[PDB]
């Protein structure tokens, strides 16, 4: 991993709201798929996501279907329910990506960006060479040189 | 690689032939050319932007040279540089001036040929007319300011200003 | 030498330590001696200049 510096975390929903621009950008989604496939694990959530989003993109310039007014509000609530389903289908994916990426990085002897967990290796966030001399969230002092997660041979 | 540039004189070859460097010196005599001795061999860099048909900015010629430090200061820059004489700067110097007609002819000349006389500028005429109008009602909100004061302070032997009321 | 190329080639022999006054504990320059009064030179102008 080349990008090492401390970062700003964005809530999952705003990441998903980027649609085609980032979250569903074809290019990105394909190399996620590559990671999964190479690990020998089906990519179902990715495929659900890709389906939902593919279709989002196809109809993205159309006006929504005409609404008739109801005291029930069954329509509004069914649209909502469907929507939060899709949101959750994608939360699951977003989680999977962060999960597997961290795990794979643990196998590749990769050091993550500052303040990032790698389950077996760095439990509290890993940090080295931050702009700030302490670990940001522990409030503990950082050693020089940067802490090493892996034994030396390569 | 770091090497010594080298030259084989044609008398030494097993066929005489005209060496490209020798030709280069010919070309330098003909169109008199400064040969920069310190020009680093490593620094050939075309200007990608203007010289590659791949960029929308493609003129076909090396618009700038890509040398970071290069400045108007350097003797080399001075030697190939367009002097300001007879460029647009000269054109501005002459044609852009406060009253554009003073570019075409002497005002006095024109005035004296066309009208019988020199004419004051419009502004001056305004102040003149106004003085005449407001000297007709009130007097003595005024002052007497001249270029040369001696003419008022010692007036000629005659000159008895008409009393006013 | 400026830091860009040869910085590591600077020597301690470049410092005019005899010109200033140091604090023993810190290792820092506290004061500077006066330069001009005792200053002797055979070359106010370069050697080849005769006015």
């Amino acid at each position: 991993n080349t990008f090492l510096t401390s970062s700003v975390a964005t809530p999952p929903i705003s990441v998903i709201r980027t649609g085609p621009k980032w979250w569903a950008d074809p290019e990105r989604m394909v190399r996620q798929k590559l990671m999964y496939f190479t690990l020998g694990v089906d990519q179902l959530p990715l495929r659900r996501t890709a389906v939902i989003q593919r279709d989002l993109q196809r109809f993205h310039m159309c006006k929504p279907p005409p609404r008739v007014g109801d005291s029930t509000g069954y329509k509004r609530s069914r649209a909502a329910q469907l929507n939060t389903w899709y949101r959750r289908i994608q939360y699951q994916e977003y989680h999977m990506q962060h999960l597997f990426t961290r795990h794979v990085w643990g196998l590749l002897r990769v050091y993550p960006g500052n303040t990032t967990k790698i389950q077996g290796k760095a439990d509290d966030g890993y940090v080295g060479y931050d702009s700030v001399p302490f670990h940001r969230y522990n409030r503990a002092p950082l050693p020089f040189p940067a802490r090493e997660l892996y034994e030396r041979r390569k | 690689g770091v090497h010594r540039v080298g030259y084989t004189h044609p008398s030494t070859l097993p066929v005489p032939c005209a060496q490209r460097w020798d030709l280069r010196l010919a070309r330098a005599r003909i169109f008199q050319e400064y040969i920069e001795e310190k020009a680093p061999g490593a620094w050939q860099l075309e200007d990608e932007r203007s010289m590659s048909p791949e960029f929308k900015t493609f003129t076909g010629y090396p618009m700038r040279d890509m040398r970071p430090g290069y400045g108007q200061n350097l003797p080399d820059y001075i030697m190939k540089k367009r002097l300001p004489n007879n460029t647009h700067y000269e054109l501005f110097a002459r044609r852009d001036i406060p009253n554009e007609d003073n570019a075409m002819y002497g005002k006095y000349l024109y005035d004296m040929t066309v009208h019988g006389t020199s004419l004051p500028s419009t502004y001056r005429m305004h102040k003149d007319i106004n003085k005449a109008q407001r000297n007709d009602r009130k007097l003595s909100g005024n002052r007497f300011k001249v270029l040369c004061s001696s003419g008022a302070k010692n007036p000629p032997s005659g000159w008895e200003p008409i009393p006013d009321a | 030498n400026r830091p860009e190329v040869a910085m590591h080639r600077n020597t301690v022999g470049l410092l005019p330590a005899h010109m200033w006054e140091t604090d023993k504990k810190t290792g820092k320059v506290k004061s500077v001696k006066d330069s001009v009064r005792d200053y002797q030179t055979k070359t106010p102008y370069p050697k080849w200049v005769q006015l």
Partner: protein, 142 residues
């Protein structure tokens, strides 16, 4: 302008905080000209080459009666120290004199020996409002 510190206070507009093209601001105010660097000492705000000759302004060019201050791009020379002659420079409020000669000055331009913006402030060139605003920024005590 709001306050007229010179004639130009009358002629010029500020235009808020307005951007000018790179390294052309209409008025050359070199606040940085004395800005200490040990390693860059000989390259910063000085001649780009050490083989350049000293400027025009180190020489007496014509028949002079005398001068009031020498220019600030004049470079301090061993003779400035040694000769014991008046060396003045035009700074604000009035003039800065080099009175206490040192060899440490030698080879730099007086731009670099004269602090343009002093940490010292006159309370008497300040309006009561301006003094307030200088207390807000934590400069003047009050």
């Amino acid at each position: 302008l709001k306050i007229a510190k010179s004639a130009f206070g009358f002629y010029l507009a500020r235009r808020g905080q307005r951007k000018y093209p790179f390294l052309r601001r209409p008025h050359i105010k070199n606040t940085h000209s004395m800005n200490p660097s040990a390693p860059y000492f000989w390259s910063f705000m000085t001649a780009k080459s050490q083989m350049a000759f000293l400027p025009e302004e180190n020489y007496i060019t014509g028949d002079w009666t005398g001068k009031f201050f020498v220019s600030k791009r004049q470079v301090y020379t061993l003779q400035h120290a040694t000769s014991g002659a008046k060396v003045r420079v035009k700074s604000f409020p009035s003039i800065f004199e080099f009175n206490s000669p040192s060899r440490w000055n030698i080879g730099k331009e007086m731009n670099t020996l004269t602090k343009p913006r002093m940490d010292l402030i006159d309370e008497q060139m300040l309006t009561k409002k301006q003094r307030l605003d200088y207390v807000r920024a934590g400069l003047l005590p009050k």
